[PDB]
């Protein structure tokens, strides 16, 4: 397939390298405002193709997205000194809208995966300005945090991550919700299995939830940014579209009305295939989860409203 | 690793071909009473290695199992005319015991996977005569029927088989038990999800259970025997030992006491790694399931007792 | 892609199983005159798909080849008692012509790979009766014998088969020609490298040529037939069409005039891609090789002429 | 296997990410003088392991190399302003010696692959200070430039890179030597095949030689540095050790006396397996090639001598 990447920073370039090794792209267009950087990146990957699958990689402009099966948006600006988070978001939101008109124009039939943070806020702004199908434009969301929570549990208990079931939903941020009420290992409720398993107990499941929601912060304090993790997750998402797998992924999707939350992009279990999102799984949230989920949706709508209100 | 296959009939040879393409064997010993057939089989696979991974394949005798990481038993005799099923089993049971002393003698440290039918009856006879660890000798059991039930459901509902959870336990035969009470799709109970999904409803889940328990009969009426399906399942089991995955598989294991069934080999969810079986998952069976499961164990013990009683 | 297999005997079925594990077919049609056998084969492979890629496999009739990207012909009859080889060939040649009209009719745009023996004689009869493009219909030829000769040499000398160059051309039979004059290891002529390498010398390269041309005979004396080797080679050929690789393969192609041989199907280095054969490499044969090659072409034309003459 | 990476700059980290996706490391130790950067890198890759194979990745110190099967050296310092190339090399050479004593001390049984530029000069300094086996310590050399030259030719002519033979030897720099005299496509000399092929002719083969020796310069002018290409090449080299393939690679090896060049590390065709380098292929260089090769060795020895002379 043909893949376009808009924004070749640490994440865009890592995503490109990963997609290259997976071998999903026949043609790969790299688009960044700093054309010189995008071109050197393209030549570097081209110089490594003798060890990967043949791919037509090149640094282009928006007109090249024509024919793109998937367009990945890893484009954004860095917080200026003094700069406020609302301002920062104001700038990034404007970046999203700009890229959107162009993707809408040259690649109207593509599937777009937004990756920049805040992912749920920026995906909503991109979708709105784009005017495309909500089943074909979405954000990576909590996909990575869900997989990470399943992995921590699995390796502590002596199981394959394949045997562990858990979903983290909501804002891909401080207010995400691990849905512990539907968690299992071997289909057996996470609580029986948790205290059969030795290196498991209540204090440890809480650490996990905490180790996963802090992962990015901890990487950033040490090296300024995360790019590898999200790169591998974007490859994994693309992998489901590529083979039309219909796997369930907690992607940030535009929901018309899900458990009382409305008109916003947020993460919930949906199935992904070659035509984009298909089924949205409505979860049976216990009381505390429903409340946390709802509060999450409100933190997002508020942010959406402050920005929509500070550009008018 | 080094793999030995004892019994190169339709199943043994198909299993060997499949294992060859997976590339799990560095050395592969083929043992059959008809040495001429085993040798031509070995030369044929050797002649195809230019397209697979290097492997040291050869037709040997029992002394060659020395060093075997895994030994697969697909050895058995065909029902003579007039021959009774009890007699037939009497003969096959004797085959199992014979192979057992030899495997015990030359490859005491291997992991053995019994595949011949009746799988639960013959595995029990093999284990007993062998005197090996019940965590390292087991039968393939209901592994294939479980995967097949998950696949039917999945493709009818528009999900990846990875999102479907169901276990079929008990005798790998007419009395197997699909554990519908713990069935799910996306962690959501199979009943909500079943009637959200269009090509699903009660009459169809019953067909599935029936299509999967009859699969072998239907193949046999048409071509005399099954070998491809079981070959792919044996490869899959070996794959878990090979990468030490700890995946949950409904293998036929020797149970000391599981839900009131005792002293017999039967299928239940257990985890498989490089050292053999590790955890046995005790399932929460509803009333009717517990009863079906128990009846299953009784059909097996009876058969075990009739044969143990018609060789003394 | 969609693949049809006409003739599900030991080879056709082995080829189907192998193609299934490679995961090249989205849809697979099995056609055999013994419909009951083809159907049980289809159900067996279907029952194993939970461990492979989703594939639409089924036993059909000629009308189903519609849309086939590749059609494999492993169909043929066995020598009756008393039966002469010329007669036998007369029968098989008639089988080839029959299958040809049907493939021409329902799948005129497919790429056909003939596999039945004698491969060069039967491919020529199939092509002629079919009236299709000589670049899209061909026989597997010496593909397997070439790979096997490269492998023997490589493993004796301590090199990867990738570093060994040799071609065996001509009749895929007793008169095949290993082109020793262009043989190399690391691009260094096989003779310098041969006596630098310890387990190499003139008497051993001759054994190799002999071990490879006798491989099938030796398998057949032991188990009645070869099927695994050729199955893996057919998968490998299909693999080049599938990813459009343009790899060089000694396939049995219809040559209009190559080194003085004319109007016949015989093996020589040609490149294979998604559209079939592309380039035919004309080799620089030394004196003795040119003579052996020519004699080979004459043994084939003679056989072609005796059969064309004993059906008129 | 266990892999250590010393120097996590753009190349070290790219190499780590690539090795991670290949799945060659069971345990991966990242060592950089800037421990904070190495630790954030380790956490980032760990956070992405839910999508790759289980691996024990962590930022350590030299004592952790204990047990390392392979150690990769991508460590070096950047040219200070005003700084001379000889000085720069003086500094980097000292870095190499330092890392060497430590690798010699804690991981004496590992295979080391030097990657920093100048690769042939720095590998020689590392080997000398280390006192290890010349068959287990070497530089990546011209591996990437050789593959790139084979790829350019192949895709222009309509062949698989597998069918193209060419070696580039000598200094991995401005004086590298493409050995055109032994170049082939399908074993047919590159000159016949070159003017049979349309998009090939003398002016184009020269462009190729030029496009490949300038690749890094062109990347660097655009984005300051190359890391992806070399990362994929290092993975490929590790891949040969990992599966003990014995593939021929133009690695920078210590040569005692090869075609009159002596006591230096330079690139030539050697075979690589699980125990390191095995066979060194002595090439039949025509006149002009022998001269270019020799001049190459002299440019390297001179540099080696100026540095050995400006630290005493
Ligand atoms: N650690 C992280 O990865 C992290 C942390 C916080 C926020 N973010 C957000 O997510 C984004 C992705 O992070 P990154 O580290 O890969 O970014 P980065 O530091 O590489 O910056 C963005 C890249 O996108 C490009 N770009 C900007 N505007 C563009 C436009 N209009 N059209 C095309 N290309 C454009 C820039 O030129 C730059 O190359 C960030 O820009 C930021 O807003 C990321
Ligand atoms: N459709 C089926 O696959 C099927 C159906 C019913 C029962 N079974 C049972 O499972 C077994 C596997 O089926 P198959 O179709 O692959 O078998 P098969 O028809 O090929 O027969 C068994 C093979 O095992 C070999 N063998 C027998 N005793 C041996 C011994 N003592 N030591 C070494 N090798 C020995 C035989 O020589 C023969 O090659 C059968 O023997 C049978 O008892 C299979
Ligand atoms: N060892 C070998 O593999 C070998 C040796 C000598 C010759 N051959 C030749 O190559 C062929 C392939 O060998 P095999 O062992 O796989 O064959 P086989 O023994 O399975 O016999 C051929 C199969 O092709 C089917 N078939 C025959 N005519 C057909 C038709 N007109 N339409 C559709 N299907 C048809 C038959 O029903 C049978 O299922 C042989 O038929 C023979 O002529 C093979
Ligand atoms: N474009 C290129 O990749 C390029 C171009 C010219 C030269 N080089 C040479 O090859 C090397 C690899 O290039 P890069 O771009 O990946 O480097 P880089 O810019 O990331 O710099 C080197 C890294 O190695 C680390 N390091 C330095 N000394 C160390 C020590 N003694 N122990 C442990 N870690 C140490 C540094 O802290 C830094 O993280 C360069 O340092 C340079 O000497 C590379
Ligand atoms: O929209 P555009 O300008 O056609 O972009 C694509 C073209 O630019 C190129 O990628 C070259 O770009 P760079 O010169 O910047 O490397 C061509 O290879 C490609 O066909
Ligand atoms: O591992 P099993 O036996 O399929 O059962 C549970 C796993 O499947 C699940 O439905 C999860 O599926 P997904 O994660 O693909 O949505 C949960 O039950 C858990 O994730
Ligand atoms: O127990 P044994 O007789 O050593 O068996 C193994 C030996 O037999 C062989 O496999 C050859 O067997 P065949 O001659 O029957 O083909 C050797 O290659 C191998 O080393
Ligand atoms: O040319 P036809 O008869 O449509 O053949 C294909 C059809 O036959 C089937 O394969 C079933 O064949 P069998 O009943 O013989 O198994 C269908 O699944 C398929 O759509
Ligand atoms: O030589 P050392 O200090 O044991 O290094 C390895 C140890 O450091 C760790 O990698 C942790 O390193 P960081 O705390 O820097 O992340 C452990 O996980 C590991 O066992
Ligand atoms: O592609 P073939 O037919 O093996 O022949 C040539 C290729 O093999 C070669 O020996 C090259 O081998 P390596 O590149 O592995 O050393 C050359 O002849 C060319 O690289």
């Amino acid at each position: 397939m043909k893949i376009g990447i808009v924004g070749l920073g640490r994440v865009g370039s890592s995503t490109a390298f990963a997609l290259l090794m997976k071998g999903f792209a026949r043609e790969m267009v790299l688009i960044d405002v700093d054309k010189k950087r995008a071109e050197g990146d393209a030549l570097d990957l081209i110089h490594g193709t003798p060890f990967t699958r043949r791919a037509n990689i090149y640094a282009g402009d928006y007109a090249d997205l024509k024919g793109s099966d998937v367009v990945i948006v890893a484009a954004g600006v860095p917080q200026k000194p003094g700069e406020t988070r609302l301002q920062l978001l104001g700038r990034n939101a404007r970046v999203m809208k700009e890229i959107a008109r162009n993707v809408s124009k040259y690649a109207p039939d593509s599937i777009v995966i937004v990756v920049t943070n805040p992912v749920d806020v920026l995906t909503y702004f991109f979708l709105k300005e784009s005017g495309m199908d909500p089943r074909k434009v979405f954000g990576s969301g909590t996909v990575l945090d869900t997989a990470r929570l399943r992995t921590l549990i699995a390796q502590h208990c002596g199981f394959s991550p394949r045997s562990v079931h858990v979903y983290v939903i909501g804002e891909h941020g401080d207010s995400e919700v691990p849905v512990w009420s539907g968690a299992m290992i071997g289909g057996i409720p996470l609580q029986n299995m948790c205290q059969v398993c030795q290196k498991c107990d209540s204090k440890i499941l809480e650490n996990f939830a905490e180790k996963t929601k802090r992962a990015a912060y901890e990487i950033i304090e040490r090296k300024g940014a995360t790019h590898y993790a999200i790169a591998l997750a974007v490859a994994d998402i693309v992998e489901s579209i590529f083979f039309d797998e219909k796997r369930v992924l907690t992607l940030s999707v535009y929901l018309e009305d899900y458990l009382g939350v409305k008109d916003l992009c947020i993460s919930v279990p949906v199935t992904l295939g070659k035509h984009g999102v298909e089924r949205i799984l409505e979860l049976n949230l216990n009381e505390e989860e429903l409340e946390a989920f709802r509060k999450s949706a409100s933190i997002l709508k508020n942010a959406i409203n402050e920005i929509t209100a500070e550009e008018n």
Side-chain angles (χ1 to χ4, degrees), chain A:
Chain A
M1 68 192 178
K2 179 176 177 170
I3 296 184
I5 311 306
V6 183
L8 273 291
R10 321 192 52 174
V11 176
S13 39
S14 280
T15 297
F17 182 44
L19 242 10
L20 176 66
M21 293 178 257
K22 300 285 279 190
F24 297 143
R26 135 185 67 83
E27 187 164 344
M28 187 186 277
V29 191
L30 310 188
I31 301 169
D32 198 286
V33 140
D34 180 353
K35 300 181 296 291
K36 216 191 178 71
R37 187 271 182 286
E39 198 195 18
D41 238 2
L43 295 171
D44 193 9
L45 293 157
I46 276 159
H47 192 43
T49 58
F51 308 105
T52 74
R53 155 213 171 141
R54 295 183 202 138
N56 177 206
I57 309 152
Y58 61 86
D61 52 47
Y62 295 125
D64 295 304
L65 302 177
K66 169 175 199 170
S68 280
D69 298 86
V70 174
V71 174
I72 287 167
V73 181
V77 310
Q79 201 166 67
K80 271 142 48 226
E83 255 224 328
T84 273
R85 223 213 154 210
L86 161 84
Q87 302 182 307
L88 176 59
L89 302 221
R91 294 166 66 214
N92 281 289
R94 270 187 257 93
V95 166
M96 295 303 126
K97 300 177 176 196
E98 164 57 28
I99 304 166
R101 300 190 280 266
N102 289 105
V103 177
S104 177
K105 185 184 189 197
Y106 306 97
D109 299 352
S110 59
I111 291 172
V112 19
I113 309 175
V114 180
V115 157
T116 305
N117 312 293
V119 81
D120 315 281
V121 180
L122 301 179
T123 305
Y124 170 88
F125 278 131
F126 187 103
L127 207 221
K128 175 195 162 277
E129 181 73 280
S130 86
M132 292 178 269
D133 188 341
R135 293 220 296 208
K136 314 199 60 206
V137 177
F138 48 84
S140 48
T142 49
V143 167
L144 205 223
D145 298 349
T146 293
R148 185 71 191 277
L149 188 57
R150 292 191 188 201
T151 290
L152 287 151
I153 290 162
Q155 49 190 207
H156 254 77
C157 296
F159 289 77
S160 163
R162 193 178 315 190
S163 291
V164 172
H165 176 76
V166 217
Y167 288 122
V168 339
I169 66 178
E171 179 209 27
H172 169 44
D174 296 350
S175 72
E176 56 184 42
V177 183
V179 184
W180 297 115
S181 55
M184 304 170 282
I185 294 187
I188 288 168
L190 173 44
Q191 55 172 346
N192 319 41
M193 227 73 248
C194 184
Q195 233 31 69
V196 175
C197 162
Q198 168 253 12
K199 213 317 205 121
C200 200
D201 105 60
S202 321
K203 192 33 170 176
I204 114 161
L205 288 181
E206 298 189 53
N207 290 3
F208 288 166
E210 193 77 11
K211 198 179 194 176
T212 119
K213 71 186 293 164
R214 304 214 93 250
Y217 291 134
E218 294 289 311
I219 288 169
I220 292 167
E221 310 160 3
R222 280 158 183 85
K223 78 178 206 190
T226 307
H227 52 266
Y228 292 135
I230 171 277
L232 286 165
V234 172
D236 186 62
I237 295 165
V238 169
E239 178 165 359
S240 195
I241 293 168
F242 193 91
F243 294 104
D244 190 40
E245 291 169 348
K246 298 160 196 333
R247 271 156 47 215
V248 177
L249 261 9
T250 60
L251 297 167
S252 181
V253 296
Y254 184 75
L255 297 166
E256 196 79 77
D257 206 67
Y258 177 106
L259 266 47
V261 307
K262 62 309 92 205
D263 200 273
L264 96 168
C265 287
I266 192 165
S267 294
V268 302
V270 308
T271 57
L272 187 59
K274 71 186 156 182
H275 278 288
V277 180
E278 298 184 352
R279 292 163 174 70
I280 292 188
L281 311 194
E282 200 175 277
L283 287 186
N284 171 243
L285 310 190
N286 83 10
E287 23 269 301
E288 52 166 303
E289 283 157 5
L290 184 40
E291 189 174 324
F293 177 70
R294 287 174 157 138
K295 179 198 172 176
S296 210
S298 90
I299 295 180
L300 295 178
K301 305 192 87 320
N302 196 242
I304 292 173
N305 285 340
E306 298 201 347
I307 308 165
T308 308
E310 271 282 338
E311 245 127 288
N312 302 347

